[PDB]
Amino acid sequence: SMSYTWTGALITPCVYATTSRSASLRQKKVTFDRLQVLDDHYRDVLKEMKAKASTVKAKLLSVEEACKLTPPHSARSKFGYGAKDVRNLSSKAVNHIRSVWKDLLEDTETPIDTTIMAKNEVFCVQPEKGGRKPARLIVFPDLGVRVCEKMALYDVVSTLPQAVMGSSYGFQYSPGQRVEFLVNAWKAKKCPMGFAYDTRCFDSTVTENDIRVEESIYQCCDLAPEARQAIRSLTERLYIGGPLTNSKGQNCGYRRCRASGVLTTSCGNTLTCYLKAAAACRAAKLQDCTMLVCGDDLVVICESAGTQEDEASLRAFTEAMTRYSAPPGDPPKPEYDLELITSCSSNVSVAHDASGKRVYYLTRDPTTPLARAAWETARHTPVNSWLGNIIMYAPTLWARMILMTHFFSILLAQEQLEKALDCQIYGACYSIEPLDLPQIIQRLHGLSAFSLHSYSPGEINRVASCLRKLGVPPLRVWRHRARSVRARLLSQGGRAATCGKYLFNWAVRTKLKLTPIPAASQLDLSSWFVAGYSGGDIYHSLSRARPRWFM
Ligand SMILES: O=C(O)/C=C/c1ccc(NC(=O)C2(NC(=O)c3ccc4c(C5CCCCC5)c5n(c4c3)CC(=O)Nc3ccccc3-5)CCCC2)cc1
Numbered sequence: 156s157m158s159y160t161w162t163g164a165l166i167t168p169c170v171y172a173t174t175s176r177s178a179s180l181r182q183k184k185v186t187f188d189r190l191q192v193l194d195d196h197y198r199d200v201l202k203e204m205k206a207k208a209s210t211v212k213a214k215l216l217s218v219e220e221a222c223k224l225t226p227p228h229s230a231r232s233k234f235g236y237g238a239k240d241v242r243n244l245s246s247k248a249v250n251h252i253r254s255v256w257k258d259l260l261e262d263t264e265t266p267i268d269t270t271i272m273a274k275n276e277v278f279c280v281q282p283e284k285g286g287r288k289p290a291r292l293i294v295f296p297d298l299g300v301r302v303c304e305k306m307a308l309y310d311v312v313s314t315l316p317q318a319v320m321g322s323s324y325g326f327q328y329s330p331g332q333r334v335e336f337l338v339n340a341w342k343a344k345k346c347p348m349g350f351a352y353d354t355r356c357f358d359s360t361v362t363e364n365d366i367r368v369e370e371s372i373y374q375c376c377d378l379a380p381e382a383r384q385a386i387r388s389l390t391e392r393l394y395i396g397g398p399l400t401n402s403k404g405q406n407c408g409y410r411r412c413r414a415s416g417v418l419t420t421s422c423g424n425t426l427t428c429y430l431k432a433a434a435a436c437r438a439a440k441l442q443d444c445t446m447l448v449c450g451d452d453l454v455v456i457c458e459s460a461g462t463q464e465d466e467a468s469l470r471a472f473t474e475a476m477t478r479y480s481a482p483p484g485d486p487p488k489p490e491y492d493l494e495l496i497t498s499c500s501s502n503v504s505v506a507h508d509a510s511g512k513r514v515y516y517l518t519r520d521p522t523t524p525l526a527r528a529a530w531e532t533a534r535h536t537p538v539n540s541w542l543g544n545i546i547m548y549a550p551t552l553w554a555r556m557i558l559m560t561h562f563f564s565i566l567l568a569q570e571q572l573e574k575a576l577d578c579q580i581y582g583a584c585y586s587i588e589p590l591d592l593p594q595i596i597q598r599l600h601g602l603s604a605f606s607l608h609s610y611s612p613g614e615i616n617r618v619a620s621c622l623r624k625l626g627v628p629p630l631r632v633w634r635h636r637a638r639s640v641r642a643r644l645l646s647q648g649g650r651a652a653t654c655g656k657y658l659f660n661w662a663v664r665t666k667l668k669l670t671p672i673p674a675a676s677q678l679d680l681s682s683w684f685v686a687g688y689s690g691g692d693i694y695h696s697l698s699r700a701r702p703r704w705f706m
């Protein structure tokens with residue numbers, strides 16, 4: 156079947172930013188008939204996944220619990236209420252949500268409407284390879300439906316992926332735990348070989364059968380009968396496909412592939428990619444495979460069979476993925492150093508802590524983080540990518556010297572150190588106070604994140620070259636700026652002083668011997684790094700448990 160069919164009605168509007176103007180170019184790329192051929196490897200892997208899914212017991216979320224996960228600025232309903240009404244449990248919001256639920260239980264077939272829009276994302280104007288990337292397409296149902304999806308499937312999509320894929324499920328790891336997993340897998344092999352597999356437009360490649368196979372896995376859970384019916388109806392009426400409406404309310408077309416903005420997108424894509432890849436590893440005869448899967452992002456570490464043999468096994472893996480309707484974007488290439496593999500737009504690098512001991516950490520090319528940060532300093536944005544980058548990339552040279560210095564100087568100038576900001580981590584929205592960053596960083600990366608040094612030449616050069624290319628002052632300027640930022644933070648005391656002392660410890664000549672922040676243990680990070688919710692419309696406000704008077 157065709158991934159999409161179009162009426163011709165335009166996908167209407169809401170360093171460069173992707174707009175609604177480039178939507179036509181994206182539509183051409185993602186529109187095609189899918190040819191899927193399944194085999195015994197696929198069937199064997201599915202049965203193994205199902206046996207693991209069978210250990211899961213999932214609970215039905217109440218209307219109140221589902222309402223509480225809704226982001227404050229989530230798209231309003233076309234039925235007379237918005238995200239504020241949902242979070243307040245308003246009479247109108249709650250009555251409509253209950254009617255949507257009742258309809259899911261009563262109607263098992265009518266396709267549910269969705270809205271289609273072009274994603275506005277900032278990329279760097281780099282005239283080195285081709286040109287500007289076309290806008291990605293976002294497909295999502297109405298607010299009432301999104302609350303119902305949480306009631307039925309929030310517990311499933313939060314628990315089932317780890318139960319099925321075990322250590323291969325990537326969203327259970329913080330960046331440091333992801334690094335630890337990759338390093339351990341690499342060291343376990345006699346002669347390691349690793350590769351990333353890029354699927355061309357993964358959402359478009361997902362077939363009706365893929366979605367039903369994904370539902371057959373959900374159905375292995377112990378579920379409340381209404382949750383079981385809701386999952387069955389949501390599968391047929393929403394997940395499998397349905398009509399597309401643009402922002403103007405015009406019939407835009409029809410979808411028969413994965414919608415980006417439903418609660419099951421991340422879980423479903425991860426399960427689908429894992430199933431196809433594990434089956435393709437068997438068809439390719441790759442020895443002792445370790446897979447790490449995050450949605451459509453796949454990395455495989457295995458036992459090398461020699462240079463020519465590895466190139467041949469990779470082409471066999473690709474042919475098998477292609478049959479399963481997961482063809483490649485960039486062709487996969489075997490890598491023989493862990494540091495050279497790019498997965499989840501990141502690579503492993505090594506540094507030393509204050510005692511000269513090796514510390515592996517996760518980094519990336521800083522061009523896109525710096526460009527996006529520049530866009531965000533220039534104009535007000537709902538989500539602050541700089542904040543998420545400081546959190547996830549806290550041990551890196553560039554996040555510490557440039558992002559921390561620049562944004563802390565802006566917060567000091569605006570007196571907004573205590574103002575909570577939104578950032579996206581694994582598709583979920585978190586409301587975080589920048590004053591909590593030293594405690595968050597210690598919890599996720601450890602005390603060593605504040606004293607790393609002896610960065611690799613390759614890492615230092617990538618950073619320095621990127622600054623030159625973007626017209627950013629050199630690293631020596633950032634050291635001078637950080638010394639002043641640090642001094643002003645120290646003067647303020649409390650959490651602000653901890654920001655100065657811990658985040659800017661690298662900027663001082665003498666360098667302090669840092670002790671653990673006592674209040675860090677109080678942070679409730681239980682919802683962090685459990686699952687991916689990309690396009691799932693999930694929100695959390697960072698909270699503190701058992702606070703001590705003197706902290
Ligand atoms: O050789 C030496 O010894 C010293 C050299 C030297 C060179 C340049 C400066 N620049 C500055 O003082 C100014 N800009 C900056 O001090 C500046 C700060 C951050 C900048 C950023 C990002 C960095 C990441 C956080 C957000 C801001 C970008 N650009 C920046 C410029 C350059 C810029 O203009 N825009 C972009 C565009 C895309 C990406 C990055 C940038 C402020 C007043 C005059 C211009 C200072 C010293």
Ligand SMILES: NC(=O)COc1ccc2c(c1)S(=O)(=O)N=C(c1c(O)c3cc(F)ccc3n(CCC3CC3)c1=O)N2
Binds near residue numbers: 333357500543580582
């Ligand atoms: N195709 C589908 O359906 C979704 O497929 C997906 C594939 C990968 C991801 C997602 C969806 S996500 O939207 O859930 N977010 C991330 C992600 C982040 O949130 C993230 C946030 C930051 F501020 C900084 C770095 C981040 N990094 C890199 C560092 C990390 C440790 C690995 C991610 O990868 N990964």
